[PDB]
């Protein structure tokens, strides 16, 4: 039975950021769990915030506000900058 995982994308990012070092199976599983946890937090906060303002659509504003609420400080600043750069790159295509 097919099971979905983030291992390929994590390995792509690892090869981009460090062209020589490798990874182990337990470390890959830990990274998978960490990514799942973060995504669950972001989705829950966005859904709650969207319900909070009598809305029914999850657009970029709720996700930006959610990451601002969750991530602390310069992590939030850099994440917001990366997200808006990605959004502009998408729209300008």
């Amino acid at each position: 039975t097919r099971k979905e995982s983030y291992a390929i994308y994590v390995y792509k990012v690892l090869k981009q950021v460090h062209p020589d070092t490798g990874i182990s199976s337990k470390a890959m599983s830990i990274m998978n769990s960490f990514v799942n946890d973060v995504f669950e937090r972001i989705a829950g906060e966005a859904s709650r915030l969207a319900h909070y303002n009598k809305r029914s659509t999850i657009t970029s504003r709720e996700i930006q506000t959610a990451v601002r609420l969750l991530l602390p400080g310069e992590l939030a600043k850099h994440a917001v900058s990366e997200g808006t750069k990605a959004v502009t790159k998408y729209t300008s295509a």
């Binding site: 990012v13 182990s24 973060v38 859904s47 994440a79 750069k85």
Partner: protein
């Protein structure tokens, strides 16, 4: 046919995350296309942030591959990442530290 993950210049999937986001709304939710792309870039940045710190500690130990021990060192070494991640790493050990009074 151009993949949506390549138009935004990312590595994480966009269509797959869009499917997952739509399955976690409340009984009527509409998910914008731009929402998935914004969330994909957040995950890629955080993943690239941790692997940068973990990879640095692996080189300091004159070793090649990354073990769960190195992940614990990088996270606890970071102050922000320590605050963000409170989960327990299996096989990660502890940061060595001895109080002044005991010596």
């Amino acid at each position: 046919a151009v993949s949506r993950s390549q138009r935004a210049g990312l590595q994480f999937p966009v269509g797959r995350i869009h499917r997952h986001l739509k399955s976690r709304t409340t009984s009527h939710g509409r998910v914008g296309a731009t929402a998935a792309v914004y969330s994909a870039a957040i995950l890629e940045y955080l993943t690239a942030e941790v692997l940068e710190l973990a990879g640095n500690a692996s080189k300091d130990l004159k070793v090649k591959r990354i073990t769960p021990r190195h992940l614990q060192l990088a996270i606890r070494g970071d102050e922000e990442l320590d605050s963000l991640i409170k989960a327990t790493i299996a096989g990660g050990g502890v940061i060595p530290h001895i109080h002044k009074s005991l010596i």
